[PDB]
Enzyme design. Structure first.
Site, PDB file in Angstrom:
ATOM      1  N   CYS B  65     -51.692 -13.875  54.545  1.00 27.25           N
ATOM      2  CA  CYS B  65     -50.204 -14.127  54.503  1.00 27.25           C
ATOM      3  C   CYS B  65     -49.609 -15.037  53.622  1.00 27.25           C
ATOM      4  O   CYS B  65     -49.714 -16.227  54.523  1.00 27.25           O
ATOM      5  CB  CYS B  65     -49.559 -13.723  55.639  1.00 27.25           C
ATOM      6  N   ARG B  68     -46.006 -16.788  55.498  1.00 26.58           N
ATOM      7  CA  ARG B  68     -46.007 -17.373  57.006  1.00 26.58           C
ATOM      8  C   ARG B  68     -44.971 -18.347  57.344  1.00 26.58           C
ATOM      9  O   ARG B  68     -44.840 -18.698  58.343  1.00 26.58           O
ATOM     10  CB  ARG B  68     -47.420 -17.841  57.478  1.00 26.58           C
ATOM     11  N   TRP B 237     -40.190  -8.868  53.205  1.00 26.17           N
ATOM     12  CA  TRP B 237     -39.560  -8.442  52.177  1.00 26.17           C
ATOM     13  C   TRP B 237     -40.819  -8.753  51.189  1.00 26.17           C
ATOM     14  O   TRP B 237     -42.007  -9.233  51.376  1.00 26.17           O
ATOM     15  CB  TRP B 237     -38.541  -9.440  51.452  1.00 26.17           C
ATOM     16  N   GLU B 242     -46.694  -7.955  44.049  1.00 29.82           N
ATOM     17  CA  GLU B 242     -47.284  -6.741  44.803  1.00 29.82           C
ATOM     18  C   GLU B 242     -46.899  -5.433  44.049  1.00 29.82           C
ATOM     19  O   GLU B 242     -47.616  -4.383  44.085  1.00 29.82           O
ATOM     20  CB  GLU B 242     -46.894  -6.883  46.136  1.00 29.82           C
TER      21      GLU B 242
HETATM   22  C1  HEM Z   1     -41.019 -12.209  55.021  1.00 31.09           C
HETATM   23  C2  HEM Z   1     -41.702 -12.092  54.084  1.00 31.09           C
HETATM   24  C3  HEM Z   1     -43.330 -11.593  53.838  1.00 31.09           C
HETATM   25  C4  HEM Z   1     -43.825 -11.930  52.668  1.00 31.09           C
HETATM   26  C5  HEM Z   1     -43.178 -12.292  51.118  1.00 31.09           C
HETATM   27  C6  HEM Z   1     -45.089 -11.579  52.554  1.00 31.09           C
HETATM   28  C7  HEM Z   1     -46.028 -11.595  51.738  1.00 31.09           C
HETATM   29  C8  HEM Z   1     -47.443 -11.271  51.966  1.00 31.09           C
HETATM   30  C9  HEM Z   1     -48.406 -10.477  50.815  1.00 31.09           C
HETATM   31  C10 HEM Z   1     -47.885 -10.989  49.446  1.00 31.09           C
HETATM   32  C11 HEM Z   1     -49.306 -10.185  51.503  1.00 31.09           C
HETATM   33  C12 HEM Z   1     -50.586  -9.580  50.674  1.00 31.09           C
HETATM   34  C13 HEM Z   1     -50.696  -8.169  50.712  1.00 31.09           C
HETATM   35  C14 HEM Z   1     -51.199  -7.186  49.672  1.00 31.09           C
HETATM   36  O1  HEM Z   1     -51.721  -7.904  48.545  1.00 31.09           O
HETATM   37  O2  HEM Z   1     -51.439  -6.079  49.775  1.00 31.09           O
HETATM   38  C15 HEM Z   1     -49.293 -10.428  52.883  1.00 31.09           C
HETATM   39  C16 HEM Z   1     -50.241  -9.898  53.700  1.00 31.09           C
HETATM   40  C17 HEM Z   1     -49.979 -10.004  54.921  1.00 31.09           C
HETATM   41  N1  HEM Z   1     -48.671 -10.146  55.730  1.00 31.09           N
HETATM   42 FE1  HEM Z   1     -47.185 -10.890  54.856  1.00 31.09          FE
HETATM   43  N2  HEM Z   1     -45.381 -11.496  54.009  1.00 31.09           N
HETATM   44  C18 HEM Z   1     -44.348 -11.392  54.819  1.00 31.09           C
HETATM   45  C19 HEM Z   1     -43.991 -11.316  56.042  1.00 31.09           C
HETATM   46  C20 HEM Z   1     -44.980 -10.827  56.967  1.00 31.09           C
HETATM   47  C21 HEM Z   1     -44.796 -10.170  58.409  1.00 31.09           C
HETATM   48  C22 HEM Z   1     -43.186  -9.984  58.873  1.00 31.09           C
HETATM   49  C23 HEM Z   1     -45.740 -10.122  59.057  1.00 31.09           C
HETATM   50  C24 HEM Z   1     -46.021  -9.615  60.312  1.00 31.09           C
HETATM   51  C25 HEM Z   1     -45.401  -9.946  61.207  1.00 31.09           C
HETATM   52  C26 HEM Z   1     -46.905 -10.213  58.045  1.00 31.09           C
HETATM   53  C27 HEM Z   1     -48.444 -10.161  58.028  1.00 31.09           C
HETATM   54  C28 HEM Z   1     -49.133 -10.123  57.037  1.00 31.09           C
HETATM   55  C29 HEM Z   1     -50.326  -9.340  57.051  1.00 31.09           C
HETATM   56  C30 HEM Z   1     -51.138  -9.105  58.522  1.00 31.09           C
HETATM   57  C31 HEM Z   1     -51.074  -9.363  55.966  1.00 31.09           C
HETATM   58  C32 HEM Z   1     -52.397  -9.090  55.529  1.00 31.09           C
HETATM   59  C33 HEM Z   1     -52.614  -7.481  55.623  1.00 31.09           C
HETATM   60  C34 HEM Z   1     -54.079  -6.963  55.026  1.00 31.09           C
HETATM   61  O3  HEM Z   1     -54.825  -7.641  55.666  1.00 31.09           O
HETATM   62  O4  HEM Z   1     -54.238  -5.977  54.572  1.00 31.09           O
HETATM   63  N3  HEM Z   1     -46.281 -10.846  56.761  1.00 31.09           N
HETATM   64  N4  HEM Z   1     -47.950 -11.016  53.071  1.00 31.09           N
HETATM   65  N1  LIG Z   2     -55.733   4.436  56.457  1.00 37.78           N
HETATM   66  C1  LIG Z   2     -54.712   4.081  56.826  1.00 37.78           C
HETATM   67  N2  LIG Z   2     -53.865   3.648  55.932  1.00 37.78           N
HETATM   68  C2  LIG Z   2     -54.021   3.361  54.754  1.00 37.78           C
HETATM   69  C3  LIG Z   2     -53.862   4.524  53.908  1.00 37.78           C
HETATM   70  C4  LIG Z   2     -54.261   4.443  52.575  1.00 37.78           C
HETATM   71  C5  LIG Z   2     -54.475   3.207  51.836  1.00 37.78           C
HETATM   72  C6  LIG Z   2     -54.553   2.036  52.518  1.00 37.78           C
HETATM   73  C7  LIG Z   2     -55.005   0.568  52.165  1.00 37.78           C
HETATM   74  O1  LIG Z   2     -54.499  -0.219  53.438  1.00 37.78           O
HETATM   75  C8  LIG Z   2     -55.442  -1.460  53.207  1.00 37.78           C
HETATM   76  C9  LIG Z   2     -54.841  -2.706  52.624  1.00 37.78           C
HETATM   77  C10 LIG Z   2     -53.705  -3.525  53.517  1.00 37.78           C
HETATM   78  C11 LIG Z   2     -52.862  -3.784  52.333  1.00 37.78           C
HETATM   79  O2  LIG Z   2     -51.508  -3.186  52.513  1.00 37.78           O
HETATM   80  C12 LIG Z   2     -50.319  -3.406  51.865  1.00 37.78           C
HETATM   81  C13 LIG Z   2     -49.747  -4.675  52.802  1.00 37.78           C
HETATM   82  C14 LIG Z   2     -50.014  -5.476  53.675  1.00 37.78           C
HETATM   83  C15 LIG Z   2     -49.510  -6.336  54.213  1.00 37.78           C
HETATM   84  C16 LIG Z   2     -48.457  -6.828  53.616  1.00 37.78           C
HETATM   85  C17 LIG Z   2     -47.701  -6.361  52.491  1.00 37.78           C
HETATM   86  N3  LIG Z   2     -46.735  -6.786  51.638  1.00 37.78           N
HETATM   87  C18 LIG Z   2     -45.397  -7.419  52.274  1.00 37.78           C
HETATM   88  N4  LIG Z   2     -44.779  -7.606  51.590  1.00 37.78           N
HETATM   89  C19 LIG Z   2     -45.382  -6.707  53.633  1.00 37.78           C
HETATM   90  C20 LIG Z   2     -45.462  -5.809  54.455  1.00 37.78           C
HETATM   91  C21 LIG Z   2     -45.039  -6.000  55.853  1.00 37.78           C
HETATM   92  C22 LIG Z   2     -44.750  -7.202  56.292  1.00 37.78           C
HETATM   93  S1  LIG Z   2     -44.706  -8.133  54.905  1.00 37.78           S
HETATM   94  C23 LIG Z   2     -48.553  -4.916  51.988  1.00 37.78           C
HETATM   95  C24 LIG Z   2     -53.212  -3.439  51.032  1.00 37.78           C
HETATM   96  N5  LIG Z   2     -54.208  -2.318  51.404  1.00 37.78           N
HETATM   97  C25 LIG Z   2     -54.137   2.077  54.052  1.00 37.78           C
HETATM   98  C26 LIG Z   2     -54.160   4.188  58.402  1.00 37.78           C
HETATM   99  C27 LIG Z   2     -53.058   4.832  58.952  1.00 37.78           C
HETATM  100  C28 LIG Z   2     -53.253   4.599  60.326  1.00 37.78           C
HETATM  101  C29 LIG Z   2     -54.212   3.854  60.829  1.00 37.78           C
HETATM  102  S2  LIG Z   2     -55.128   3.060  59.574  1.00 37.78           S
HETATM  103 CL   LIG Z   3     -46.928  -2.322  48.931  1.00 44.61          CL
END
Ligand code: HEM
Ligand SMILES: N=C(Nc1cccc(COC[C@@H]2C[C@H](OCc3cccc(NC(=N)c4cccs4)c3)CN2)c1)c1cccs1
Ligand SMILES: [Cl-]
Ligand code: HEM
Ligand SMILES: N=C(Nc1cccc(COC[C@@H]2C[C@H](OCc3cccc(NC(=N)c4cccs4)c3)CN2)c1)c1cccs1
Ligand SMILES: C[C@H](O)[C@H](O)[C@H]1CNc2nc(N)[nH]c(=O)c2N1
Ligand SMILES: C[C@H](O)[C@H](O)[C@H]1CNc2nc(N)[nH]c(=O)c2N1
Ligand SMILES: [Cl-]
Lengths: 362, 362
Positions: B65, B68, B237, B242
């Site tokens: 992330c 953070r 947000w 993305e």
């Molecule tokens: C406040 C604005 C935030 C921004 C701009 C941001 C930005 C991002 C971005 C760009 C990613 C990569 C996602 C992707 O490529 O699909 C990401 C991943 C992630 N963010 Fe953040 N984030 C934010 C807030 C948060 C919050 C509130 C949480 C949870 C409390 C969080 C937890 C995560 C996690 C767990 C991932 C990894 C998901 C994965 O492994 O697939 N983020 N974030």
């Molecule tokens: N299989 C499932 N989901 C599912 C279905 C289709 C495709 C995918 C792909 O997901 C895996 C990875 C995971 C990642 O998901 C998108 C993602 C993850 C974290 C942050 C953000 N972007 C943001 N700015 C934020 C969002 C929230 C806070 S900040 C976007 C991309 N892709 C998952 C499941 C449903 C229930 C349990 S697993």
């Molecule tokens: Cl998305």
């Protein structure tokens, strides 16, 4: 241990190499000869066929290299016969001319005598054979900042740069037995350079950017079956982004993005305008256009990635494990637009290979 | 082992958490209470202060992330009291409305009852609470290809999409004790969407692109001191890339680059024209412009990286180890223009954290 390390590497290398060259039946006798030689002399000498194929395998195993599809067409020049600095100099001049090939660049490596007991026979100081000098004094920065330390070392040795932003560094290397390296000015007729213009933005030439045609890495050690060729300069052609997205763009290099923004007529005030991104794209377009216009070889990052995909497919078909360093393979412009970004690579180190070694100055 | 794993995690979590909250003196008694509770019930219950701070630490430890910096301002909604599907539905509706906040997005997490013995109390099927459907049949592709399997599962359950490219999937989740999930249509008044226009290319609206304002990840498990909150949707947000560089650009998503090239008036014929790169930049410019114009929160990748740098500096000042996943932190547009690209990160996993879990369909 040192002699045992040598034999173990020699055994692994000769089996694999001869197997690839269809010479499997000859491994047993060759290994025998090698073992006697290591016992007698403390080392062994590669045949020309081993040396050539070793250099090619080393390229093939270079995890960080996107250009590996063409590994088998590497042109290998065997200069293990060199004993004098005039011979070294002339071999380096020759490498520049034949690799450049009037702009139709030929991937080439010139291999000098190997280390003996960790003792270098020829110690090259240049990072690349053709490279621009860099100066920093009284807040004033000129040329390529990444060349500052070698540039200062050359000037300590009686060289003087003109202090343009594109001074060609001289060749500088040391022979076994000398306390000081020697240096020679590059003949300008050997060096192709490309002025950077843009296909439709006429003002782009106001920046007066250029770059040299042929990148010739001269500071890496080639390792083949336990033999250490510390001096073995090699070249390919450039991928455009190396020049447009890094050499000319990095803040700690030529740092040209703001100036690019200005000549392409965009504001450089707001992150949200993505002006840096737009500047990067136009500068990278200009670099490709300029090289093609001058008939100097270059590849864009899309084409290079497509070639790399074929390299992956080729490894699988040949039953060879593929290794790669994801963090270096992705291009620094639109990496998610290439297949590379969307898969992973085993970053294991396989030999023969090219390795970093400590610089001889500082 | 299972009960021992729980106690070990609880001990490590409570010490660190209480230490951060200046409550170090209370660790001993709290640990005693927890141990009795684990002995009696096979688990333990977090205090609201532990739960809130746990959710924040989990964000702080999310290696991938870039966002953070703002970990400590996470808005934590405690919904461990929920027992019915109407309560779940309404909590999810509430999360959407309060997180969206008329476009001034508030990073929020709603935490539902945790797994008991690996048994889920509430099993959410959506990947995000707001997400577009996807369809593939007889060569015909509509909507988001990454939603195809959940979309097919919803339709098996009596839902029907209109088959536009932007059908909102319903909320779909299963309660402990039911064989089938339920689904509810999202009220359109809850969902902010942003039409994608370009600041100076009027024709860009001909593409009729849009995206939803708030990404709410609803498929990850939050782990805090050995307690598994499998259902704990969270949002922030968007970072612009993305949407512009991936959701709308990837070949296996909306695949819009050729169409972008056409409306911005460039040929999409030659790799060396870097048309994909130029299209990516203009589409990404349009996405940022469109969100800002509508007063919906968004961050560009340059600003996000600068914020992340401050997060790194903050960790060092607090004496906390920084962890990160370099391959995910770099933005997919001009990554070498950010500081991230030029350093490395320890990708060690620290808990509390958010983790993937198997999907409940297929
Ligand atoms: C406040 C604005 C935030 C921004 C701009 C941001 C930005 C991002 C971005 C760009 C990613 C990569 C996602 C992707 O490529 O699909 C990401 C991943 C992630 N963010 Fe953040 N984030 C934010 C807030 C948060 C919050 C509130 C949480 C949870 C409390 C969080 C937890 C995560 C996690 C767990 C991932 C990894 C998901 C994965 O492994 O697939 N983020 N974030
Ligand atoms: N299989 C499932 N989901 C599912 C279905 C289709 C495709 C995918 C792909 O997901 C895996 C990875 C995971 C990642 O998901 C998108 C993602 C993850 C974290 C942050 C953000 N972007 C943001 N700015 C934020 C969002 C929230 C806070 S900040 C976007 C991309 N892709 C998952 C499941 C449903 C229930 C349990 S697993
Ligand atoms: Cl998305
Ligand atoms: C034929 C055209 C070639 C192209 C387009 C190409 C492309 C590249 C690129 C873009 C890099 C990354 C460099 C950087 O970011 O600074 C690279 C790395 C590398 N290439 Fe190639 N390459 C080619 C030929 C060769 C040849 C002929 C060799 C040696 C026989 C070679 C060995 C390597 C090595 C060792 C690295 C890694 C250097 C390091 O770790 O610092 N390549 N290549
Ligand atoms: N310290 C030295 N050199 C030195 C001095 C200043 C800066 C650097 C930085 O070098 C480390 C990394 C290593 C890397 O060097 C540039 C490089 C490496 C490999 C390929 C290419 N690009 C190409 N297209 C090809 C070239 C040849 C075939 S394809 C460029 C970037 N940067 C080194 C030494 C001199 C003698 C021994 S070490
Ligand atoms: C820290 C990081 O590993 C480093 O900056 C790398 C990233 N990937 C790279 N990739 C290439 N091709 N060239 C480079 O110089 C770098 N730099
Ligand atoms: C294979 C590779 O690890 C994978 O495609 C990753 C690369 N880095 C990423 N980084 C982010 N932010 N998001 C992603 O989906 C991916 N994909
Ligand atoms: Cl270079």
């Amino acid at each position: 241990e040192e002699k045992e390390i040598l034999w173990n590497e020699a055994k692994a290398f000769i089996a694999a190499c001869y197997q690839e060259l269809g010479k499997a039946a000859e491994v047993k006798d060759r290994l025998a000869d090698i073992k006697s030689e290591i016992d007698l002399t403390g080392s062994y000498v590669h045949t020309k066929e081993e040396l050539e194929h070793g250099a090619k395998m080393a390229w093939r195993n270079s995890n960080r290299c996107i250009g590996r599809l063409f590994w088998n067409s590497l042109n290998v020049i065997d200069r293990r016969d060199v004993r004098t600095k005039e011979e070294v100099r002339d071999a380096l001049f020759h490498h520049i001319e034949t690799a450049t090939n009037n702009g139709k660049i030929r991937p080439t490596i010139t291999i000098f005598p190997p280390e003996e007991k960790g003792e270098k026979q020829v110690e090259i100081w240049n990072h690349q054979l053709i490279r621009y000098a860099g100066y920093e004094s009284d807040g004033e920065r000129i040329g390529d900042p990444a060349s500052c330390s070698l540039t200062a070392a050359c000037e300590e040795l009686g060289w003087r740069g003109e202090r343009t932003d594109f001074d060609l560094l001289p060749l500088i290397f040391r022979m076994k037995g000398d306390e000081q390296p020697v240096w020679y000015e590059l003949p300008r007729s050997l060096v192709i350079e490309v002025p950077i213009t843009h296909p439709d933005i006429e003002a782009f030439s106001d920046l007066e950017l250029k770059w040299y045609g042929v990148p010739i890495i001269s500071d890496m050690k080639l390792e083949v079956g336990g033999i250490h060729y510390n001096a073995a300069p090699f070249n390919g052609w450039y991928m455009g982004t190396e020049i447009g997205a890094r050499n000319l763009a990095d803040e700690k290099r030529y740092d040209k993005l703001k100036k690019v923004a200005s000549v392409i007529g965009i504001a450089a005030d707001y992150n949200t305008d993505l002006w840096k991104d737009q500047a990067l794209v136009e500068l990278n377009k200009a670099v490709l256009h300029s090289y093609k216009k001058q008939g100097v070889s270059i590849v864009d990052h899309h084409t290079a990635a497509s070639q790399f995909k074929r390299f992956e497919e080729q490894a699988e078909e040949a039953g060879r494990k593929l290794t790669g360093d994801w963090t270096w393979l992705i291009p620094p412009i639109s990496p998610a637009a290439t297949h590379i970004f969307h898969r992973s690579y085993d970053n294991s180190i396989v030999k023969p290979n090219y390795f970093y070694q400590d610089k001889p100055y500082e």
